[PDB]
Design a binder for this molecule. Structure first.
Ligand SMILES: OC[C@H]1O[C@H](O[C@@H]2[C@H](O)[C@@H](O)O[C@H](CO)[C@H]2O)[C@@H](O)[C@@H](O)[C@@H]1O
Ligand SMILES: OC[C@H]1O[C@H](O[C@H]2[C@@H](O)[C@H](O)[C@@H](CO)O[C@@H]2O)[C@@H](O)[C@@H](O)[C@@H]1O
Ligand code: NA
Length: 342
């Protein structure tokens, strides 16, 4: 009825600061991105003006605040989401190491598991990826909240297409020069499916990924994030021994930090958009689902509770006519439907 689902992975961001913990409102303050097609300015992260079109129920919180982390784990329990997929940027700073330890300890108190979402950090390549996979498994592999499926850790790899299949083969083929296959550091490696099947099918096969995900909460942003393609993507995956983990989300809007990106807006329609994405994932017959996102406030994809808020700087969007915790409860509903279908 209410147990956590360990085939549901929710993308989680630990880059927020507060004056209480960090001494600064990190990420609530954020540079405005220049138009790809310029002195754009910065959102200052004051109470009135934050880097989101929405406004958190918990305010300008710190991701290093143990009291905030506790409340977040309670929110995961409400949503029935059993795995927290943690953004990881290879910052190599004491604050990063501290935050990962706090998140693991908080998660374990509510039986939530943690896996890593490997980001496009500077000069990312298959050698430093191996070195960082080994570090992460050695440092956190014995923590009880560290996620495993059939004895293997799992990693999502954002913008995996930035590395050529001839490089991925070295790490992920059983014969690869620096392979993790059949070693103590073997893992499930889930790459990002973006574009058409004529490009993606050979990429995934040649790179030796164990599976693929789609990430984007905005329908139609890519081929992969267009749900009418998911039945055929699942059929191809099952035929080729690959795990398909489609990404579902409640909406998208990023125009505070990207004022030129309005065409990517997807409206929430009081939950109906989320319902349509989640239904299509379940209908495709997949064995795992990813949620974009718990708390990407910059991109307006969050299921974390939000509240009404107005200032002279900006009038924020909010969840009305639904209540602030609607997207947590609606997640729990769809987790129930997914479990019926497995
Ligand atoms: O939204 C601003 C944010 O964009 C980039 O991070 C990416 C986004 O969070 C989103 O597309 O998800 C990706 C996978 O988790 C992630 O790479 C970065 O440029 C970041 O610094 C920025 O704050
Ligand atoms: O430029 C806006 C766009 O930025 C990010 O996506 C970029 C890249 O990371 C993606 O792999 C490709 C997919 O086609 O698009 C961009 O180049 C995301 O933050 C995205 O949500 C945003 O719209
Ligand atoms: Na699982």
């Amino acid at each position: 009825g209410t147990e956590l689902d360990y085939d549901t992975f929710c993308f989680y961001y630990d880059w927020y600061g507060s004056e209480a913990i960090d001494g600064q409102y990190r990420h609530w303050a954020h540079a405005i991105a220049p138009d790809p097609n310029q002195n754009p300015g910065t959102i200052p992260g004051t109470q009135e003006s934050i880097a989101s079109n929405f406004y958190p129920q918990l305010g300008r919180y710190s991701s290093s605040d143990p009291n905030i982390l506790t409340k977040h784990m309670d929110m995961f329990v409400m949503a029935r989401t059993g795995v927290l997929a943690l953004t990881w940027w290879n910052e190599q700073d004491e604050t990063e190491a501290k935050r990962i330890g706090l998140i693991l300890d908080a998660a374990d108190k509510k039986k939530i598991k943690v896996c890593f979402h490997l980001e496009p950090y500077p000069s990312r390549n298959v050698q430093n990826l191996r070195e960082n996979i080994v570090k992460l498994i050695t440092r956190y592999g014995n923590h009880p909240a560290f996620y495993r499926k059939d004895g293997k850790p799992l990693f999502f790899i954002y913008d995996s297409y930035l590395i050529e299949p001839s490089e991925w083969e070295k790490l992920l083929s059983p014969g690869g020069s620096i392979t993790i296959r059949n070693t103590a550091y073997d893992a499930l490696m889930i790459g990002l499916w973006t574009s058409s099947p004529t490009v993606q099918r050979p990429f995934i096969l040649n790179a030796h990924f164990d599976g693929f995900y789609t990430y984007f909460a905005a329908t139609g942003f890519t081929y992969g994030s267009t749900p009418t393609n998911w039945v055929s993507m699942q059929k191809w995956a099952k035929e080729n021994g690959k795990i398909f983990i489609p990404s579902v989300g409640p909406g998208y809007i990023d125009t505070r930090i990207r004022p030129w990106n309005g065409s990517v807006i997807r409206t929430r329609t009081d939950g109906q958009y989320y319902d349509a994405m989640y239904r299509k994932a379940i209908e495709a017959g997949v064995s795992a689902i990813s949620i974009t996102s718990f708390n990407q406030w910059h991109e307006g994809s969050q299921i974390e509770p939000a509240v009404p808020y107005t200032s002279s700087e900006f009038t924020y969007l909010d969840y009305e006519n639904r209540e602030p915790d609607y997207y947590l409860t609606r997640t729990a509903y769809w987790v129930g439907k997914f479990r019926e279908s497995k």
